[PDB]
């Protein structure tokens, strides 16, 4: 009677950057849906392809728990069929995404007075990300005609930037911790059931 490790994902002390988003593979457990069952109004809760009141009555093959950090103006992109720097270059959700997204304002946790430059994001990429693609490459992005060869220069920039979360910023520039729960049902034994 193992319980699905959801506390380890929501109650984590440190979250990942959006470009290197962390994923916890949860399987063969009993799902105590309660972290999402009754969520307060100050929680952004959007489910796609599945109803939350029905999750206790469904068994899935695997459930994926993706967690990372973005700013408030970018949470609208963590959704199926969305475009933008986060959706295209950091964390993309498919068009037929089956699962829920959870986001809450973490300005009291991830924002320092002198700036919290620890959280990063990808600004430049040659093409868009496929759904559930994770690109941790830090190769100098070529924006011009001459090859970079690992040289930061004109039309040759480092593809990652910092967020600089300061508490005195607006709500759209404050850090939001996002947890994306994917519910997968493939030709396999269903093991993640509810109770």
């Amino acid at each position, epitope marked *: 009677t193992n319980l699905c490790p959801f506390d380890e994902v929501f109650n984590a002390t440190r979250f990942a950057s959006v470009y290197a988003w962390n994923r916890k593979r949860i399987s063969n457990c009993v799902a105590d849906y309660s972290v999402l069952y009754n969520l307060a109004p100050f929680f952004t809760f959007k489910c796609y392809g599945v109803s939350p009141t029905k999750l206790n009555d469904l068994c899935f093959t695997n459930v994926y728990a993706d967690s990372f950090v973005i700013r408030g103006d970018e949470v609208r992109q963590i959704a199926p069929g969305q475009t*933008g*720097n986060i959706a295209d*270059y950091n964390y993309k959700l498919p068009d037929d995404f089956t699962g829920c997204v959870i986001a809450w304002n973490s300005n009291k946790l991830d924002s320092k007075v002198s700036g919290n430059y620890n959280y990063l994001y990808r600004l430049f*990429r040659k093409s*868009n990300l496929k759904p559930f693609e994770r690109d941790i490459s830090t190769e100098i992005y070529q924006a011009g005609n001459k090859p970079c060869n690992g040289v930061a220069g004109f039309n040759c920039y480092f593809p990652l930037r910092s967020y600089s979360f300061r508490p005195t910023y607006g709500v759209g520039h404050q850090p939001y911790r996002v947890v994306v729960l994917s519910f997968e049902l493939l030709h396999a034994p269903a093991t993640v059931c509810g109770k």
Partner: antibody, heavy 118, light 110 residues
Framework: EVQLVESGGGLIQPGGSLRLSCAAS????????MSWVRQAPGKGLEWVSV???????FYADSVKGRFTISRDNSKNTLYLQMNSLRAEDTAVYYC????????????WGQGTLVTVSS | EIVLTQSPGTLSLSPGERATLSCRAS???????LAWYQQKPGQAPRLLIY???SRATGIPDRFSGSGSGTDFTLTISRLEPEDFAVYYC??????????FGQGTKVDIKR
């Protein structure tokens, strides 16, 4: 040798269409944030559209449904198709490469004039 | 969205004086999301400063920027007769696209 040469402006009747070009040199359009900024005669600057290196397009609320930003990698030229033009669309249109946090909007086109009149 | 408001509207100073062009945003944004542009008559705007304080390539030393939150400043020390232009501040924190300022016109006396 970093240029952004524009062309295709001129007189167009209200409700007609016109397509602007932004020939690029030494800058690759398909690997950059390329935008279209317009400036009404005697007013400030207004950002109109942008295209990402991945192909994502975005438009300002004042040109939505009427403008379409595109590109051609073989010609290395940014385009802007304008439909249903009216009096407000009369401006000098600029293209420019966006660097966002890592350089703002450094290089700009010389700008072509679009006069909508009858 | 974010609204940008500059001040003053017109600034007439003698050559060699110090200019101070103000710019403020409706929302408290990071200092790295601001930029200043100079537009001389008949020309396209050229970047002067990005990230509020970093000077672009080839811009003279006399152009410097500062400020954070909602109080950004462009200082033009040792004003020269070729500095006659309109100066705009822009913000690219409300992606996609940017929002320009109303523009400060700088006249030059003699």
């Amino acid at each position: 040798e970093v240029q952004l040469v524009e062309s295709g402006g001129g007189l167009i009747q209200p409700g007609g269409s016109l397509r602007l070009s932004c020939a690029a040199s030494e800058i690759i359009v398909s690997r950059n944030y390329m935008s279209w900024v317009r400036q009404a005669p005697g007013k400030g600057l207004e950002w109109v559209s942008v295209i990402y290196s991945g192909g994502s397009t975005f438009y300002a609320d004042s040109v939505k449904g009427r403008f379409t930003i595109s590109r051609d990698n073989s010609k290395n030229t940014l385009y802007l198709q304008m439909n249903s033009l009216r009096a407000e669309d009369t401006a000098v249109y600029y293209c420019a490469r966006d660097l966002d946090v890592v350089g703002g909007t450094d290089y700009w086109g010389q700008g072509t004039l679009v006069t909508v009149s009858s | 969205e974010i609204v940008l408001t500059q001040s003053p509207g017109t600034l007439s100073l003698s050559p060699g004086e110090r200019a101070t062009l103000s710019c403020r945003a409706s929302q408290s944004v990071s200092s790295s999301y601001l930029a200043w542009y100079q537009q001389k008559p008949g020309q396209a705007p050229r970047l002067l400063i990005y990230g509020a304080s970093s000077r672009a390539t080839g811009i003279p030393d006399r152009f410097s920027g500062s400020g954070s939150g909602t109080d950004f400043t462009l200082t033009i020390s040792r004003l020269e007769p070729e500095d006659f232009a309109v100066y705009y501040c822009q913000q690219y924190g409300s992606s996609p696209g940017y929002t320009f300022g109303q523009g400060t016109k700088v006249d030059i006396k003699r």
